[PDB]
A paper describes a structure:
The polymerase adopts exclusively a single orientation on cryo-EM grids, making it difficult for cryo-EM to study pair recognition in this enzyme, and to allow those studies to guide synthetic biology. Reconstructions with and without the stage tilted as high as 60° are virtually indistinguishable. These strategies allowed the reconstruction to 3 Å resolution of a bacterial RNA polymerase with preferred orientation, containing an unnatural nucleotide for studying novel base pair recognition.
We applied our methods to the structure determination of RNAP, which contains a bound unnatural base. We show that high-angle stage tilts, combined with our processing workflows, can overcome issues with resolution anisotropy, leading to a molecular model that faithfully recapitulates the atomic details of the sample and describes how the UBP is bound. In the absence of stage tilt, the orientations for RNAP are distributed within a cone of ~20–25°, with a small number of sprinkled projections. We found that collecting data with the stage tilt angle set to 60° led to a nearly, but still incompletely sampled reconstruction, characterized by an SCF of 0.78. The fact that the SCF was just shy of the suggested baseline of 0.81 means that the primary projection distribution is <30° and there are few true positive orientations outside of the primary projection distribution. Our initial predicted optimal stage tilt angle was 51°, which should have led to an orientation distribution characterized by an SCF of 0.81. In practice, we found that a slightly higher stage tilt angle was necessary to yield a (nearly) fully sampled map.
Residue numbers in the entry:
A (entry chain J): 319 to 383, 415 to 794, 796 to 940, 948 to 1003, 1014 to 1026, 1136 to 1373
B (entry chain I): 399 to 411, 423 to 434, 444 to 889, 913 to 977, 1017 to 1342
C (entry chain I): 1 to 159
The structure:
DNA sequence: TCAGCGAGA
RNA sequence: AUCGAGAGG
DNA sequence: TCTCGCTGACCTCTCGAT
């Protein structure tokens, strides 16, 4: 009778609304509340504002027979990562709303918006103990994705710190010598000295000795009144240079990181509380305000607009000149308008920075302007450069109805009025921005696949004893070192003894965790490349070990046994896409190589042809360009296109004519196969190049030192150009194309395929400004490489070529070698995260994930048995997970009696 | 017919052949989609009912009869009535109206949906349908769309948009002939306007109508390009032609990004009417149209002189020219008073006219909710200071002065309807009498002798409104919990054949007597004029009056068509006033929004040199991160308007001659670079000028049409006229210390709205309660008093933490372990808390469901 | 610049620059026009209940020479007005009174004239009425039926 | 809807 | 309970 | 090698009708 089809028996087991995903993986719970969240600036990190109306009900059985002795868990709706649930000690407040600490707002993505959070009460004693020891906001100083602190001053606090620590020329009280920070505070409160007055103060600072003791150093330092006042809350053991500068968001983040590294946990939380209090107080005292006059419209825009309009008019030469094809015209118009947009943004920023000309004691000096928009910009509290240039420059280009960009520019900012046509154009960008958070968030929510493919991994032993590792090198693609060698190696063990430049001297012995001091020692040496112990080349079966993993990023020190590294890695990788797609509407819907230092031209992997003129024209498709200075080779990596011809300009080409983000990340994680790649199979050294009558040119590659040759078929149409590429390495490029991860694995190796996947994912993540540690991607790749085909098993029980767990094959080979048997040979198989998750031994996990009917049919016909050893199985059957606190219980269960 | 016309036009015109010929040789375009309104859908449902009736008639008449076949027995009205009843009440397009404010009703009535029967599906729809199209210009608002999955699919009609005979949206354009714009208007559809080139509204024109600029910006073929005067064929009729009604209410819309304009247009619809409607100081000029067309305000049907004024009713004495020959000459306008809304808000009409005041046709006589003198008033003008204040406006939060709470500027009345239904039961277990078993003396005395509560009584939680006992456990209707209020209305419903108890007869007859007295008074008010005219057919008039009174009494006493199985229904209306507190969502018209975090004492708020504190403190960091500069511009313009109003009020406080007030108000109205409005005070009389100045003493309202609003120079001039700084920023002093803030702070009056997102409606906390049947899990709603869902992502978070015992207790002890729950509650209450988790009942449900599929799944012991 | 008495009490200061040549139309004109087309008498069978009746009114047996017809229709006065419909919790509807007609012809004699014609007026269900504000009252709740954006009937060629 | 996936032709 | 229509995050 | 089904695409609240 109803229009919708009837729900059958299988419909109640499979799907999002099925039994698994709606009642076993996620349940509704008692002792839970919810209300709107408001800001409490008086709260400490371990505190939150819990209304008495809730506390009367949530603690009702406790009341029958309490707030301070029993913590509560606060929870925001998305919960993109672990810090979306934290434990606080509640203080009873009047009203209905919940008071949330301002610092944990970034960790929760919380906002005083109408936003709501849930409350949960740990009932059992063990639940309270684990809440206090693990989920407390004080224990969550550092982010799990990367070692950066997750609690950070923002908005009002950043503006207050930036107002205090900034200086002004000829401010009241300039040039006076002060006996300490207290005198500076006294002159500020008395009104005798300004907060930006450049004074000379006597500062006593402490620095840790060799044994760790604190020794004081007293000296007179050129500073300001605000910095001197701020120095009073800085704990003992930090240099004065941290506050002797205009503090932005990055400066405060670095200061908090330094405090955590030098002092520890409790000093860091105390320092964060003091910084928040001081920032709020001095942002209130500053009286910062935004006005229509604060946005200054430069006179350069009125000419740059005309220049760009004339440029595009000349570029489209009345459609009679030719080459007005839609591909070329659109690209050149977009390039011209982007050039105009960046020129106007630079012009307005330059007008705003030195808008203030200040009269000194008889001098008309120029200093950085105290404009409100500018002070909100460089402080980094809130407000990107794109938004500011939209306000005071132009809007620029907008998102097309399609994925492309509008041809027509807005050519107007928001301080000035917009035409109805321009506003109609910007409505397209508005629709795209809201549609990204409305629909594209499903693509991010990748996260579930990553969680399920990797949820089985738990750190199980201290160390393998292995020696394998991966090369770590800096990234200099963009003309600067985007990822220094310290960022890659920090907090990870060393597989091989790092040797000092030269020989017989080792800076870092192997099997030592490279913490901040070891990284500084490595940076003392001019150059260093370290082979780092990794998780993909981990000898542990059924898990990973602490040494091959590295350091617990959230806790700083080395990771302990029992930590679910797979879930943490999956959450860390999955969050940035989800968070960035949501923040798309914040924006509003909006040819040569030049080296830093001149020198002689060097090249790497380059094949070129001599042009008719003296210039050199590149012929190879993949060519890299690196310059050498008068002192050494310049540290950049650049890509030279096929048609390119060669502060010195060393390359020239036309990007227009040749003579995705999360989709790309998913393609890498699903082990997609590109159509083009064709690379050498086995190292031979001789290519026969025999003549074959068949249309597809046939390649026979025969070894110099081996009798058995290899023959391959190379279609001429599919692969137009074929090189020699002999015996350099099995996997050498024979035809031009994007390399396939499966072939790259099979030919080069596990380490090489891991490096390829990690680099290709991190390029996409870095393009958007996201910073995630590489060990998470390495964990995910390790989950990708779990199946092997046992070719030529011999004495093993495997029959012909069948997919088998790599751990089982390795254990069988070890047992056979103990008994003297030859063992089974195998080839590692690369499986996408979906297929690898569906191919797990347990059928309950596969049924819960996806393909429920098919998985159940396979398990039923095959008579499979599930041992319930992973996290998801024990969650479903409602027992303790084999991780964290329950890891000891699960190990006791495995050891049995 | 429209389909045949489209088929002929597409092929430039055997029918199947022509389609194949052109196939061998954009759907989102408006020319491919037409509008289907309520009338056509009702006609289609009538067609469905009528074809069902026709099938029934054919089946009945297939037998054939000589003289025994008649129209009556052949047809039956049941299928048609069933079909129409299903359409009006169960159709997807038949929606519960949004009744938060007049603007919400206007937007709902002007709403256009691409979904519905014979339409698209939100999950199947792609990006092409959801995106703006060049044909949306002037027909569908590009700004106002839902923020959820319904984006792009649910759309709002533009201000000037119509529908032609064929159902295609069309827009008005000014015909341009020989280079001069002509006042004649031609409505053009998308396919019709595609051929023509259309000039823009922002095109300067001379006195004769010629375009000022040599080259005029235009559009053609879906693209905008510069054009000369000769080629121009049409011009936009207004600058509001593109935006909808809701989006046109935003002042300075061209200074906002379309995202924040969308947010403001949506949040204008959740604004709750307050105790006093306060006009927007800065507006657009569309408030009057919205208020009049919404129908919430009583509008004089005929022009006349007011004869009687009252809170509940207004009487108009119609003019001699406007009376019908048979008409007595009296128009009575009864006013809605404290009635519940669809969204549980209050509907109130208050007269805005005085006795003896002349009235013409179309004048507003009473002000509906969120209306002030015929102008839509969705919020209150508030003095805002854009500056951080100790982190109490930290992250988009809002700090509110205690004077706002004291003056009840944002206090709202919310009416809650509770119903008590008595059903028929064998052996008479259920009772409805006042006497109930095990009832407190105070609770019994609270209810009347009829068992119902008295009108006007104050009721708190756990108090019975209507007395009832059933077996006999008390089935009395009572307020659920927490909710408190006063009984403003009680309605008792009984069927014609339903037995009426004497006490229930007493209550129902009291209500009916009140209604009959009201009706008799209303009839006698009109009959008095006719009787007086007869004094200057008395028996006939008396007989007609008696007949009308008897008919009204019969209509009042007519039994209601109660549902089968129930005897009487008693409805109790509770009205309570909600005062703002920390946790209430506040927002403006430019996309800005926030939650009150603290109620700050009046002395602690920042104050000016004159000692006047600010009402609202807003973080300035939320302005440049977003792209809502319109809020800053509106703040400056509101400051200037309040300065003008303050000057007028100052001249009113000390007695000033009417000449000075006339001169100042004329100067204020004449200010502006070039304004079409020409207010001439020389035409007005002295009393009219005094009344205007009295209305302007709280601030002169300002109208800024979208894409045609006030320039910055005009705002600066208005600030100058009010003796205020042109920068819009003033020196503020800290209330707690008296120390001047180191930088000037912009201060002005911004129109703030209170949204229907109160914290008391949202605050919830459950310890334990009812559990579902199929799965022994807590319920899933605040109304059902259920727990919060602990989704899979939260389980992932606990797994990442390694919190094994917390996750185990949340999976089993807090849900699905019936024995575990039962033992845990005793353990927690006793104070020695220990849990023994077991198998969740959901796992057993899964096992049973899998076994019912034919697959044997078991629990292997070892 | 204020002529109405309501606007004369308080004139809003207008900063607009562009002259207004076409006044804002009635905001709810679409609902009123649609329901007026649906309800009002149509001399031709193009729109409304008239067009609806001309579709399936001629219900008769196959080749029986006895068909059912009608002459016109009329909508009666509603029993209750909007306010007491909302109070009572009942639909605000108007009874539909339709005058039907039936014709009887000679059996197996098509050439012969019609034996008799029977016309009579019959009540046919309740049709809900829309108030002056463009809304409907259904079961005591005030409802709005929004317009639908659907593809125009005809032929289109898309890939 | 829109993809991607292997397995029949 | 389910479905439809909305809304907030 | 290429069609061809089969698979996939967080939390909360309000209302009424079945
Ligand atoms: N899973 C999921 N699907 C969704 O569709 N949406 C989600 N979550 N949110 C949550 O709410 C935050 C943004 O909401 P908003 O209104 O506060 O926007 P905003 O930019 O952060 O601040 P503002 O409104 O002041 O401009 C966002 O992170 C997320 O947690 C909102 C929509
Ligand atoms: Mg928010
Ligand atoms: Zn290891």
């Amino acid at each position: 009778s109803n229009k919708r089809p009837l729900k059958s028996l299988a419909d109640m087991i499979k799907g999002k609304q099925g039994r698994f995903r709606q009642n076993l993986l996620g349940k509704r719970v008692d002792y839970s509340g919810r209300s709107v969240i408001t800001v409490g600036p008086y709260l400490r990190l371990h505190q939150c504002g819990l209304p008495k109306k809730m506390a009367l009900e949530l603690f009702k059985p406790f009341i029958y027979g309490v707030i301070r002795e029993h913590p509560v868990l606060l929870n925001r709706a998305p919960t993109l990562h672990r810090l979306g649930i934290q434990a606080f000690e509640p203080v009873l407040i009047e009203g209905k709303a919940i008071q949330l600490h301002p610092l944990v707002c970034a960790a929760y993505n919380a906002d005083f918006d109408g936003d709501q959070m849930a409350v949960h009460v740990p009932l059992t004693l063990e639940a309270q103990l684990e809440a206090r020891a693990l989920m407390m906001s004080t224990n969550n100083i550092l982010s799990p994705a990367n070692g950066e602190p997750i609690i950070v001053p923002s908005q009002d606090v950043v503006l207050g710190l930036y107002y205090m620590t900034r200086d002004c020329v000829n401010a009241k009280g300039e040039g006076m010598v002060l006996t300490g920070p207290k005198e500076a505070e006294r002159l500020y409160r008395s009104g005798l000295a300004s907060l930006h007055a450049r004074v000379k103060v006597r500062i006593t600072e402490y620095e840790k000795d060799a044994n760790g003791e604190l020794v004081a150093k007293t000296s007179l330092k050129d500073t300001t009144v605000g910095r001197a006042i701020l120095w009073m809350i800085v704990p003992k053991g930090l240099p004065y240079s941290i506050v002797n500068q205009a503090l932005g968001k990055k400066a405060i983040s670095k200061m908090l990181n330094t405090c955590y590294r030098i002092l520890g946990l409790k000093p860091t939380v105390i320092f964060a509380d003091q910084i928040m209090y001081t920032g709020f107080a001095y942002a209130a005292r500053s009286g910062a305000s935004v006005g229509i006059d604060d946005m200054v419209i430069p006179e350069k825009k009125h000419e740059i607009i005309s220049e760009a309009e004339a440029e595009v008019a000349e570029i489209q030469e009345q459609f009679q000149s030719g080459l007005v094809t839609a591909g070329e015209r659109y690209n050149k118009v977009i390039d011209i308008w982007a050039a105009a947009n960046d020129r106007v943004s630079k012009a307005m920023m330059d007008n705003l920075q030195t808008e203030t000309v200040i009269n000194r004691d008889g001098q008309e000096e120029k200093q950085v302007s105290f404009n409100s928009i500018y002070m909100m910009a460089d402080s980094g509290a809130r407000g990107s450069a794109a938004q500011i240039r939209q306000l005071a420059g132009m809007r620029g280009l907008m998102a097309k109805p399609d994925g492309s960009i509008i041809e027509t520019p807005i050519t107007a900012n928001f301080r000035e009025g917009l035409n109805v046509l321009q506003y109609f154009i910007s409505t397209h960008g508005a629709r795209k921005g809201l549609a990204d958070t409305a629909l594209k968030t499903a693509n991010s929510g990748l996260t579930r696949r990553l969680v399920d493919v990797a949820q089985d991994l738990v750190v199980t032993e201290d160390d393998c004893g292995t020696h394998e590792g991966i090369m770590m090198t800096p990234v200099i693609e963009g003309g600067d070192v985007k990822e220094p060698l310290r960022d890659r190696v920090l907090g990870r063990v060393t597989a091989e003894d790092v040797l000092k430049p030269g020989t017989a001297d080792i800076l870092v012995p192997r099997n030592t965790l490279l913490h901040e001091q070891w990284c500084d020692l490595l940076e003392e040496n001019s150059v260093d490349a370290v082979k780092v112990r990794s998780v993909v080349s981990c000898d542990t079966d059924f898990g990973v070990c602490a040494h091959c993993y590295g350091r617990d990023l959230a806790r700083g020190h080395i990771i302990n046994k029992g930590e679910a590294i797979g879930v943490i890695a999956a959450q860390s990788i999955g969050e940035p896409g989800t968070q960035l797609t949501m923040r798309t509407f914040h924006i509003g819907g909006a040819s040569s190589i030049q080296v830093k230092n001149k020198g002689s031209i060097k090249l790497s992997n380059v094949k070129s042809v001599v042009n008719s003129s003296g210039k050199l024209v590149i012929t190879s498709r993949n060519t890299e360009l690196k310059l050498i200075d008068e002192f050494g080779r310049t540290k950049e990596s650049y890509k030279v296109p096929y048609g390119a011809v060669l502060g010195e300009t060393v390359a020239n080409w036309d990007p227009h004519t040749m003579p995705g983000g999360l989709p790309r990340v998913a393609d890498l994680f699903e082990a997609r196969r590109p159509k083009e790649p064709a690379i050498l199979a086995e190292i031979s050294g001789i290519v026969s190049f025999g003549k074959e009558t068949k249309g597809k040119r046939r390649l026979v590659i025969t070894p110099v030192d081996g009798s058995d040759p290899y023959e391959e078929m190379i279609p001429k149409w599919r692969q137009l150009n074929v090189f020699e590429g002999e015996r350099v390495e099995r996997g050498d490029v024979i035809s031009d194309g994007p390399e396939a991860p499966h072939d790259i694995l099979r030919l080069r190796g596990v380490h090489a395929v891991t490096r390829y996947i990690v680099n290709e994912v991190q390029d996409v993540y870095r393009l958007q400004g996201v910073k995630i540690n590489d060990k998470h991607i390495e964990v995910i790749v390790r989950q990708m490489l779990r199946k092997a085909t046992i070719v030529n098993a011999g004495s093993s029980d495997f029959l012909e070529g069948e997919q088998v767990e790599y751990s089982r094959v390795k254990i069988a080979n070890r047992e056979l070698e103990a008994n003297g048997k030859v063992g089974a040979t195998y080839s590692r198989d690369l499986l996408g995260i979906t297929k690898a998750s569906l191919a797990t031994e347990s059928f309950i996990s596969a049924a819960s994930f996806q393909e429920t009917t098919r998985v159940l049919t396979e398990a039923a016909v095959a008579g499979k048995r599930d041992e319930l050893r992973g996290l998801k199985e024990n969650v479903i059957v409602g027992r303790l997970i084999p991780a964290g606190t329950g890891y000891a219980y699960h190990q006791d269960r495995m050891r049995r009696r | 017919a429209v389909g045949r016309m489209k088929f002929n036009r597409s092929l430039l015109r055997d029918d199947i052949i022509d389609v194949m010929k052109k196939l061998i040789d954009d759907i989102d375009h408006l020319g491919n989609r037409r509008i289907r309104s309520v009338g056509e859908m009702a006609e289609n449902q009538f067609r469905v009912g009528l074809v069902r009736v026709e099938r029934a008639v054919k089946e009945r008449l297939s037998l054939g009869d000589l003289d025994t076949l008649m129209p009556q027995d052949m047809i039956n009205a049941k299928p048609i009535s069933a079909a129409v009843k299903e359409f009006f009440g169960s159709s997807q397009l038949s929606q519960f109206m949004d009744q938060n404010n007049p603007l919400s009703e206007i937007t709902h009535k002007r709403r256009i949906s691409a979904l519905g029967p014979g339409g698209l599906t939100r999950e199947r729809a792609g990006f092409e349908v959801r995106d703006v199209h060049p044909t949306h210009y002037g027909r569908v608002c590009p700004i106002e769309t839902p923020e959820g999955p319904n984006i792009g699919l649910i759309n709002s009609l533009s201000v000037y948009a119509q529908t032609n005979e064929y159902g295609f949206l069309e827009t008005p354009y000014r015909k341009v002939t020989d280079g001069v714009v002509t006042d004649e208007i031609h409505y053009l559809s998308a396919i019709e306007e595609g051929n023509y080139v259309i000039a823009q509204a922002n095109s300067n024109l001379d006195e004769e109508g010629h375009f000022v600029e040599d080259l005029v910006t235009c559009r053609s073929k879906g693209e905008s390009s510069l054009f000369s005067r000769d080629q121009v064929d049409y011009m936009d009729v207004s600058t509001q032609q593109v935006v909808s009604v809701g989006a046109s209410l935003i002042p300075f819309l061209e200074h906002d990004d379309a995202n924040r304009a969308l947010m403001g247009a949506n949040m204008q619809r959740q604004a709750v009417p307050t105790l006093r409607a306060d006009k927007p100081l800065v507006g657009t000029g569309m408030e009057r149209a919205v208020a009049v067309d919404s129908g919430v305000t009583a509008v004089a049907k005929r022009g006349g002189v007011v004869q009687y004024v009252d809170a509940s009713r207004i009487v108009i004495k119609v003019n001699e020219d406007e009376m019908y020959p048979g008409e007595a000459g009296i128009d009575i306008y009864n006013l809605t008073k404290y009635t519940r809304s669809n969204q549980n808000t209050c509907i109130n009409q208050m007269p805005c006219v005085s006795l003896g005041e002349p009235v013409e046709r179309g004048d507003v006589l009473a002000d509906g909710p969120s209306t002030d003198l015929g102008e839509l008033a969705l919020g209150q003008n508030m003095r805002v200071a854009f500056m951080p204040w100790n982190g109490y406006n930290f992250e988009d939060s809002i700090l509110v002065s205690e004077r706002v709470v004291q003056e009840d500027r944002f206090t709202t009345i919310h009416i809650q309807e509770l119903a008590c239904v008595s059903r028929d039961t064998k052996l008479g277990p259920e009772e409805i009498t006042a006497d109930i078993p095990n009832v407190g003396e105070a609770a019994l005395s609270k209810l009347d002798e009829s068992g119902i509560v008295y009108i006007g009584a104050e009721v708190t939680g756990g108090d019975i409104l209507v007395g009832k006992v059933t077996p006999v456990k008390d089935s009395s209707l009572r307020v659920p919990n927490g909710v408190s209020g006063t009984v403003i209305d009680v309605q008792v419903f009984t069927r014609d054949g339903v037995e009426k108890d004497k006490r229930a007869l007493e209550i129902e007859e009291m209500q009916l007597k009140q209604a009959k007295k009201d009706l008799s008074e209303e009839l006698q008010i009109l009959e008095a004029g006719l009787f007086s005219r007869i004094r200057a057919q008395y028996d006939e008039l008396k007989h007609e009056f008696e007949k009308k009174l008897e008919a009204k009494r019969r209509k009042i006493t007519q039994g209601d068509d109660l549902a089968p199985g129930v005897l009487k229904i008693v409805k109790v209306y509770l009205a309570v006033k909600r005062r703002i507190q920390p946790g209430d969502k506040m927002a403006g018209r430019h996309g800005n929004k926030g939650v009150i975090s603290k109620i700050n004492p009046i002395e602690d708020m920042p104050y000016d040199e004159n000692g006047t504190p600010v009402d609202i403190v807003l973080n300035p960091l939320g302005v440049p991160s977003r792209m809502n500069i319109g809020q800053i511009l509106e703040t400056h313009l509101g400051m200037a308007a309040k300065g003008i109003g303050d000057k007028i009020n100052a001249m009113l406080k000390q007695q000033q001659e009417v000449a000075k007030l006339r001169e100042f108000i004329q100067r204020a109205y004449d200010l502006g670079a070039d304004v079409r409005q020409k207010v001439d005070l020389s035409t007005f009389s002295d009393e009219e000028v005094m009344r205007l100045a009295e209305n302007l003493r709280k601030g002169m309202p300002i109208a800024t049409p979208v894409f045609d609003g006030a320039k910055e120079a005009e705002i600066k001039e208005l600030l100058k006229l009010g003796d205020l700084p042109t920068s819009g920023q003033i020196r503020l002093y800290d209330g707690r210390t008296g120390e001047q803030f180191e930088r000037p702070v912009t201060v002005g009056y911004m129109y703030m709205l209170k949204l229907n997102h109160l914290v008391d409606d949202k605050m919830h906390a459950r310890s334990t309660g009812s559990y579902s049947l199929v799965t022994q899990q807590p319920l899933g709603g605040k109304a059902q008093f259920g727990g919060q869902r602990f989704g899979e992502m939260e389980v992932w978070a606990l797994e990442a933490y390694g919190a094994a015992y917390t996750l185990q207790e949340m999976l089993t002890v807090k849900s699905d372990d019936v024995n575990g729950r039962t033992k845990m509650y005793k353990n927690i209450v006793d104070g020695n808390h220990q849990m023994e988790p077991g198998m969740p009942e959901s796992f057993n449900v899964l096992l049973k469901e899998i076994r019912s599929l034919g697959i044997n799944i078991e629990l292997e012991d070892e | 610049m204020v002529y109405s008495y309501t606007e004369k009490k308080r004139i809003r200061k207008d900063f607009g620059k562009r002259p207004q040549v076409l006044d804002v139309p009635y905001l709810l004109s679409i609902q009123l026009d649609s329901f007026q087309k649906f309800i009002e008498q149509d001399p031709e069978g193009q729109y409304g209940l008239e067009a609806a009746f001309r579709s399936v009114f001629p219900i008769q047996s196959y080749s029986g020479n006895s068909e059912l017809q009608y002459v016109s229709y009329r909508l009666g006065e509603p029993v209750f007005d909007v306010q007491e419909c909302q109070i009572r919790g009942v639909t605000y509807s108007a009874p539909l009174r339709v005058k039907l007609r039936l014709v009887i012809y000679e059996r197996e004699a098509p050439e012969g004239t019609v034996k008799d014609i029977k016309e009579q007026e019959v009540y046919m269900g309740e049709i809900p009425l829309m108030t002056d504000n463009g809304t409907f009252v259904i079961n005591g709740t005030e409802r709005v039926i929004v317009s639908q954006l659907h593809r125009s009937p005809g032929v289109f060629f898309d890939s």
